[PDB]
Subunit: 224 residues, 4 copies
Amino acid sequence: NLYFQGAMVNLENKTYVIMGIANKRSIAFGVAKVLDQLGAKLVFTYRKERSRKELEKLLEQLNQPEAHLYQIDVQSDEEVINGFEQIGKDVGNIDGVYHSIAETSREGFLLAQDISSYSLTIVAHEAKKLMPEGGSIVATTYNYNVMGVAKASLEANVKYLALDLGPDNIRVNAISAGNTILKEIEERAPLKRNVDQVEVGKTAAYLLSDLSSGVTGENIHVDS
Amino acid sequence: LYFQGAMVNLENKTYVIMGIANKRSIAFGVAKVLDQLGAKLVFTYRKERSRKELEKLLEQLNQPEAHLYQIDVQSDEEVINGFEQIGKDVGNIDGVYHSIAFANMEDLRGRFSETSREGFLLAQDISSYSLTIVAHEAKKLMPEGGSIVATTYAVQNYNVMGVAKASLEANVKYLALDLGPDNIRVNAISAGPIRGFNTILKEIEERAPLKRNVDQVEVGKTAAYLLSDLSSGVTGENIHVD
Amino acid sequence: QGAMVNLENKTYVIMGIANKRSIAFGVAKVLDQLGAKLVFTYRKERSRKELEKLLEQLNQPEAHLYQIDVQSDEEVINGFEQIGKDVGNIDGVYHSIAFANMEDFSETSREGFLLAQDISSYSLTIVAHEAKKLMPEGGSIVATTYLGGVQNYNVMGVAKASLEANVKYLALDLGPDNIRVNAISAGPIRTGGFNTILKEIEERAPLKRNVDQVEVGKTAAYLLSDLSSGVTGENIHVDSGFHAIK
Amino acid sequence: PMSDYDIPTTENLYFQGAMVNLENKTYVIMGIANKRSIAFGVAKVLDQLGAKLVFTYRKERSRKELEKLLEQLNQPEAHLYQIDVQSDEEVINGFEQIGKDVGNIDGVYHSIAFANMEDLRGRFSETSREGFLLAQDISSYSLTIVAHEAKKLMPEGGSIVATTYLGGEFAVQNYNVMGVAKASLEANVKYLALDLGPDNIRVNAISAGPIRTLSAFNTILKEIEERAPLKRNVDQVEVGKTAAYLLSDLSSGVTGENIHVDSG
């Protein structure tokens, strides 16, 4: 009865925005390579206009007919609003967004909440508009530590964004990537980052596709 | 590691699927999904009734050779020998989808009181310990490693099954721990919620009331992700679908 | 290991009184009756006068009032320094923000998001850094959140998650200094369709009712006192068990 | 900008309020074996706060011990019942007799036992069905049977506390199965809280000991070897103090909770 083998994931006629690639070693770059091989149409954002020349180079290792590169510093509203606006005109609606997340002072603390947590709120608020039929949003992470408070804040934000956007048929999820010193020592190996990239890419493919339908508000831990 | 996508399916993989009792069984959504992805499937069952329903359900699948094994998970003998025999017939496997038919838990429940010792231990036996002994015997068939997936699925006063479930979820995380050095991932799937006139109008349209929705295919898809190499860096996790 | 357990000869700074219905006022009555010396903070002159009327129902032989806006690094540092000079070392701080002050800038706005982070979570951090200085022999810091019930985006829900994480990291940080940090999650307090969910939580919660300010005060007394000397980094739900129905 | 003025005191309180007072309360205390028992610390504490105390024991050696420890408490009346929780009839009869002797109680304190067995010596995936289910029966079901009988003595409501002490008994290769029995207990606490809430019976747990957590690893061996001095001594009193909070009106509105009592 069945004459052909089915594919678990296939992203042809799907468009995704991939944010926060800096270099060949970025976790998002491995997500790109994976989504590219699944035949997705990819759009890329970058913070500093001083690194557009690098993304262009990276995009060569990719099978992408036309290159869509946008400068968006997400700390700036106008760049996130305008940025996503352009995307809407250039490539139409999208299917999802991959977002790569980057006693102490008040400013130190609120800045980490801005950079590591609210960034997901504003991305989601603007990208919402290019997802009239539903879509999927993935966020990835890789005296006391405000970094730990910032991450806890984001995890919570994934949860509430999920309930919030659930009615719009928009799923929001997160990936957590990464004598316990032995493990930090390992993570230092080129081979190891390489392995991290493909594994997060594979897991993001699951979350960004219909393969993970019915899955929202979740935080999947990707390790080794 | 080299992804090489496009070729992303379960051709050449073999899984043991437990917990099918009929067309509506959630484990049947899993079976259909894996079947369409190219996997070879081995099925377990406790009751004859369930074996005949399986023989019928295989009609709608694309398994050349049918593989049905009677295993009552409450019997060590039947788990050990069942799995031994699976290895003889089919060789090494890639994973197990662990589940208990919804029928088993409702009949062997109206027997004991929610509060009874016997009731409590029986829920713990079938719902949690079954996974431990299943993993221990299936492990013998996954020498290069593999993937095990356990699913999670009427209260009067005391919800004894709620406790069996929590027990199972912890069982999963500790198996994940114990089995990592053997390259065997262990994960769970649960029903998801967290992890006025228009409602009435919605009901009027369905010609029916709206209740607990768990979609068999949505479970099969997540199961396939968890049983596949897609999820290579994922263990001791609990994924909520709904 | 002695007979009496009460708050005699203990001194606590209480934050978060706006009016007679503030959870913090419930805490104050409880602590007062147990014998503690209370120092009160406020920001607005409104809440300064209000505290003056409310102190007249307690048994403080003295009103200790300090103006401390938690949004100001200067006021927190100087305020706690004055307290130190006026009253000496303290045994703890009750930290909360009055529900009244939460007076509804856009839910999804960057400012909105960060103001909640600033008010609900960071205020604990700086309060703890300055109060630490008055607790050289250790002490107890309690942080309370209130389910203040909601268009689409639960921005305060994020802020709460932040506070809770903050409690735990402070408890880890301040532990060697012998200073305990804990949180209280107060259920809804009856204090018309907005809050017809006091009826939902009620009938659904295990204890089949709502809690009140005084019940929160009882748990705060426990956390501030030596009865909980081995307890830090916790989060106690004073909510008729509603938390458990998940 | 501050204020520091006098308020008249003529209408103030004349006495010292007590945070916890247990004078008209009766508690059943389970789990005392010797002077080092966590439950003996709870006893000391509840006694010093005026509670009427009843004690259950399993072994005879513990009965002798209880008679010796009672002379350190201020209980005009001794009341000792043999109750083995592994037995339905013993739990049912025991609380029956307690009811006949002292009438209604205000709560129960239950030390959670963890049985040592053969399965503790091996890997978790090798755990026998019997070993697994024994851990479940002892460490988790125990709380169900006790709540079931004790609630018969709490018509107007009460408070139930279960305590797990993570000490040397956990320094085994197969702490995993104890982990699973513990996880089962935490959930039992919550589902009992749900079940008994409508009866105004609160159910809570305390976790204590030199081991921080069993979550998912012989870091556990080091936590044991590196115990603080007098670790069980401080825990005895600090658990007792927390138990007093949970067993009394001081913790009203609080149910389904697990409070971690760790002085580190």
